């Protein structure tokens, strides 16, 4: 945060509005009590913006030589095996919760439905997210193996 | 062989004993049967609930 | 020359090494020499044949049984007995076929094993074309 | 101005006395064999071989604009009576905790070196092929010049290419059979998961 | 690192060169026969009486001609008694040289035993000794299958890259350029919708 003194003289004659003229008025007001008291009775707090050239931006942004090469680098295959097995197993356990849920859960009063049938930590949604993340990955996995084989030989 | 303690097969007309020490079948495919298995129960339930709409 | 022989992987044949060391090392007492010691000289053969087998498993992945019997200068049945005994000690991993056709020395390749190795081969070529390029930049400077 | 370097240095150590002189940056574009002499000057001050870190300021391409080179004196099999030379060294980038958070605060891009979702990585597979092609092409036209335009026979370059041909993949190996087993596994799991999403949306 | 000074007498310079060649014949892992000719030490005097039979043995080994080795060897073994006492070492080098040459230039990484036997002018019994000796020296690594009568190499030791060979590399890479390239096109075209 950045600050610039105010003169006591300004505050005594109540001439302080001069310093806060023609502005958007966005002031950080985080931190109060003694700190804020001191600030109001001594300095003025105003915004900080960060300006940078696009030359600077690009140098920083650029990463490794091996960055643009990585797609033919591939995971060790013992880990892909492990991952395939973990996902099939996990969904099974949340699927139990989901079957129990739609036994009933067609009455009334929203919040009660969620406590009765464990609609909190909702199983349908948590399952839909895991199922898809794993599905997309497995497309990437195959894609790399086939390409590696064929491109090189 | 039948107890399973070397679990192989006896080739009678060639009078040789084949021994295979391969453990039980791949885990991954079996775990798929369990996942698909649940899903059938999910669908039966889904149709009853949906009967009201039809 | 004896110790280095038994720790090198050149194939040595019992009937040959025998004649060699008879007028030199067998004269010397202890282990060889005397009458008690001549009943120690005998065991030496065994040690040799079993050191040949250990090398042979690693180098020849498939070898015919018959060739092995000539090389070790042993009868077939005997040869078969020593192989079984060696697999037992766990030194080597082998599959012996009693119809006396072929002896297969094999290392189980689980699916992972071949794939991971192959993984490394692909990665290293990627690294090689990039590095080869770095040193090519330099050659332009020199010319 | 030699003297300047010593005067600057002592104030700088007060700030942080961990730091030591280790070499010099050169503002590119590109290596010179006049640098060999330059390097030697710095070596007087330094207790380690000075690093010549060519930070190229022209930022050509999106690839790293650092090559690193160190002056080493080595003997060589050709006949040369000791050669003095600059050997390429691998350049990577690491940033501190303090530094890293500055990089991310600055950036406002969507990013695409993230290699995150199906979309970024979809691009990334194509990007790598063409990445390779450009490099490969450079190797190829360079080989023509060696046996036609009398660029020296640099035995090191050729020597390295042998590993590439020896460790090149092969088909009809029982590895190839192995890849097919894996391919079936991954498509298999893909289908069970595909059906599983059909159920959720239908609810 | 030899002083550029020519103060070291020509007689001394040749004499030492001579020694290297003799060692290299009788060695077991040296294939720098070509290296010597690319170094000044031999390069500048190639007319001397000593440098007839001697250079010729070396070029004999390189191409793996056993008829050329035989003829020379009869004469030379007599002249120098060193080669007589190391008769076995000298006989082996021609054989070793030839098996590795053939494995390098052949692009397939398996070769039948029959090819080696005729190539090397040795019976088939002697093939199994030679591959075994070679894996042990570490010149090559691989496996021996007697039931497909193949020897599968999996590693080759670095070698000088002759002129002719520089041309070969270019060829393998040109072919691999086209493989990369044709593949990239399909994949550029398909899935056009998404590259963002």
UniProtKB/Swiss-Prot annotation, chain A:
Keywords: Acetylation, Hydrolase, Metal-binding, Metalloprotease, Protease, Proteasome, Thiol protease, Ubl conjugation pathway, Zinc
GO MF assignments: cysteine-type deubiquitinase activity; metal ion binding; metal-dependent deubiquitinase activity; metallopeptidase activity; proteasome binding
The keyword Nucleotidyltransferase is annotated on this UniProt entry: no
Reactions mediated catalytically: Thiol-dependent hydrolysis of ester, thioester, amide, peptide and isopeptide bonds formed by the C-terminal Gly of ubiquitin (a 76-residue protein attached to proteins as an intracellular targeting signal)
Superkingdom assignment: Eukaryota
Any Gene Ontology CC annotation: nucleus
Enzyme class at the top of the EC tree: hydrolase
Keyword field contains Zinc: yes
GO biological process: mitochondrial fission; peroxisome fission; proteasome assembly; proteasome storage granule assembly; proteasome-mediated ubiquitin-dependent protein catabolic process; protein deubiquitination
Signal peptide: none
EC number(s) recorded for this UniProt protein: 3.4.19.12
Post-translational modification: N-acetylated by NAT3.
Family as reported in the entry's similarity comment: Belongs to the peptidase M67A family.
Record's subunit section: Component of the lid subcomplex of the 19S proteasome regulatory particle complex (also named PA700 complex). The 26S proteasome consists of a 20S proteasome core and two 19S regulatory subunits. Interacts directly with RPN8 and STS1.
Domain comment (free text): The JAMM motif is required for the deubiquitination and degradation of ubiquitinated substrates.
Miscellaneous: Present with 16400 molecules/cell in log phase SD medium.
Protein name in the entry: Ubiquitin carboxyl-terminal hydrolase RPN11
Gene name for this UniProt entry: RPN11
Full-sequence portion shown in this chain: 154 to 306 of 306
From Swiss-Prot, chain B:
The record's account of how the chain is modified after translation: N-acetylated by NAT1.
Role, per record: Component of the lid subcomplex of the 26S proteasome, a multiprotein complex involved in the ATP-dependent degradation of ubiquitinated proteins. In the complex, RPN6 is required for proteasome assembly.
Miscellaneous comment: Present with 16800 molecules/cell in log phase SD medium.
Record family assignment: Belongs to the proteasome subunit S9 family.
Subunit (UniProt): Component of the lid subcomplex of the 19S proteasome regulatory particle complex (also named PA700 complex). The 26S proteasome consists of a 20S proteasome core and two 19S regulatory subunits.
Protein name in UniProt: 26S proteasome regulatory subunit RPN6
Gene designation per UniProt: RPN6
Residues of the full protein shown: 381 to 434 of 434
Swiss-Prot record, chain D:
Changes after translation: N-acetylated by NAT1.
UniProt entry keywords in alphabetical sequence: Acetylation, Phosphoprotein, Proteasome
Entry GO MF terms: metallopeptidase activity
Secretion signal, residue range per the UniProt entry: none
Annotated GO biological process: proteasome-mediated ubiquitin-dependent protein catabolic process; ubiquitin-dependent protein catabolic process
Cellular compartments per GO CC: proteasome complex; proteasome regulatory particle, lid subcomplex; proteasome storage granule
Family to which the UniProt record says this protein belongs: Belongs to the peptidase M67A family.
Additional notes on this entry: Present with 19800 molecules/cell in log phase SD medium.
Job of this protein: Acts as a regulatory subunit of the 26S proteasome which is involved in the ATP-dependent degradation of ubiquitinated proteins.
Name of the molecule in the record: 26S proteasome regulatory subunit RPN8
Organism: Saccharomyces cerevisiae (strain ATCC 204508 / S288c) (Baker's yeast)
Positions spanned in the full protein: 69 to 271 of 338
Curated annotation (Swiss-Prot), chain E:
Domain of life of the source: Eukaryota
Domain PCI residues, every copy: 1-158
Membrane-crossing residue ranges in chain numbering: none
Note: Present with 12400 molecules/cell in log phase SD medium.
Family of the protein in this entry: Belongs to the proteasome subunit S11 family.
Function: Acts as a regulatory subunit of the 26S proteasome which is involved in the ATP-dependent degradation of ubiquitinated proteins.
Protein name: 26S proteasome regulatory subunit RPN9
Organism listed in the record: Saccharomyces cerevisiae (strain ATCC 204508 / S288c) (Baker's yeast)
């Amino acid at each position: 945060d950045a600050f610039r003194l105010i003169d006591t003289g300004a505050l005594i004659n109540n001439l302080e509005p001069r310093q806060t003229t023609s502005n958007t008025g966005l002031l950080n007001k985080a931190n109060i009590q003694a700190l804020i008291h001191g600030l109001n009775r001594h300095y003025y707090s105003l915004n900080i913006d960060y300006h940078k050239t696009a030359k600077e931006t690009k140098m920083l942004m650029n990463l490794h030589k091996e960055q643009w090469q990585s797609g033919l680098k591939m995971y060790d295959y013992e880990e892909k095996e492990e991952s395939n097995l973990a996902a099939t197993k996990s969904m099974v356990k949340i699927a139990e919760q989901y079957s129990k849920r739609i036994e009933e859960e067609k009455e009334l009063t929203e919040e009660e439905l969620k406590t009765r049938y464990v609609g909190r930590q909702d199983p349908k949604k948590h399952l839909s997210e895991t199922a898809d993340e794993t599905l997309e990955n497995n497309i990437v996995s195959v894609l790399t193996a086939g390409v590696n084989s064929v491109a090189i030989k | 062989i039948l107890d399973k303690i070397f679990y192989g097969v006896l080739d009678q007309g060639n009078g040789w004993l084949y021994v295979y020490e391969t453990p039980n079948q791949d885990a991954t495919y079996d775990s798929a049967l369990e996942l698909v298995g649940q899903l059938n129960k999910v669908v039966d339930q889904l149709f009853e609930k949906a009967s009201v709409l039809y | 020359s004896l110790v280095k022989l038994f720790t090198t992987n050149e194939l040595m044949r019992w009937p040959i090494v025998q004649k060699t060391y008879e007028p030199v090392l067998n004269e010397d007492d202890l282990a060889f020499g005397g009458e008690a010691n001549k009943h120690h000289w005998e065991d030496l053969q065994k040690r040799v044949i079993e050191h040949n087998l250990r090398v042979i498993s690693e180098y020849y992945s498939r070898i015919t049984l018959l060739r092995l019997n000539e090389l070790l200068d042993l009868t077939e049945s005997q040869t078969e007995t020593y192989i079984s005994d060696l697999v037992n000690q766990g030194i080597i991993y082998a599959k012996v076929n009693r119809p006396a056709k072929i002896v297969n020395f094999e290392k189980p390749k689980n699916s992972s094993q071949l794939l991971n190795e192959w993984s490394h081969n692909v990665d290293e070529l990627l690294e090689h074309i990039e590095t080869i390029g770095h040193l090519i930049t330099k050659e332009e400077i020199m010319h | 101005d030699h003297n300047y370097i010593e005067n600057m240095n002592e104030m700088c150590k007060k700030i942080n006395a961990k730091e030591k002189l280790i070499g010099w940056y050169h503002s590119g574009p590109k290596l010179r064999a006049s640098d060999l002499k330059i390097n030697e000057l710095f070596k007087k001050y330094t207790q380690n071989n000075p690093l010549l870190l060519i930070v190229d300021v022209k930022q050509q391409g999106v690839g790293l604009p650092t090559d690193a080179y160190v002056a080493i004196e080595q003997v060589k099999d050709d006949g040369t009576s000791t050669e003095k030379t600059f050997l390429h060294l691998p350049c990577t980038i690491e940033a501190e905790e303090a530094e890293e958070i500055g990089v991310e605060h600055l950036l406002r891009d969507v990013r695409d070196q993230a290699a995150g979702g199906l979309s970024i990585r979809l691009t990334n597979q194509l990007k790598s092929l063409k990445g390779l092609q450009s490099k490969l092409k450079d190797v190829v036209e360079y080989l023509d010049k060696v046996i036609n335009k009398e660029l020296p026979i640099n035995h090191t370059i050729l020597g390295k290419l042998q590993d590439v041909f020896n460790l090149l993949p092969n088909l009809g190996t029982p590895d190839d059979d192995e890849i097919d087993v894996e391919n079936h596994d991954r498509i298999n799991i893909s289908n069970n998961l595909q059906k599983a999403l059909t159920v959720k949306t239908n609810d | 690192t030899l002083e550029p000074s020519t103060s070291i007498t020509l007689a001394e310079r040749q004499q030492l060169a001579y020694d290297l060649s003799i060692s290299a014949l009788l060695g077991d892992k040296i294939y720098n026969f070509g290296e010597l000719l690319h170094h000044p030490i031999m390069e500048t005097i190639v007319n001397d009486s000593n440098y007839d039979w001697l250079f010729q043995l070396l070029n004999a080994l390189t191409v793996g001609d056993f008829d050329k080795f035989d003829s020379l060897i009869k004469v030379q073994i007599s002249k120098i008694p060193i080669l007589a006492q190391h008769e076995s070492f000298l006989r082996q080098k021609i054989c070793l040289m030839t098996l590795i040459e053939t494995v390098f230039v052949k692009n397939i990484r398996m070769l039948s035993f029959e090819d080696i036997s005729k190539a090397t002018h040795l019976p088939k019994d002697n093939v199994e000794h030679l591959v075994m000796r070679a894996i042990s020296l570490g010149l090559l690594k691989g496996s021996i299958d007697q039931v497909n009568e193949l020897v599968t190499i999996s590693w080759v030791q670095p070698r000088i890259i002759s002129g002719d060979q520089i041309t070969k590399m270019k060829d393998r890479l040109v072919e691999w350029n086209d493989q990369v390239e044709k593949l990239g096109k399909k994949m550029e075209a398909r899935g056009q919708s998404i590259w963002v």
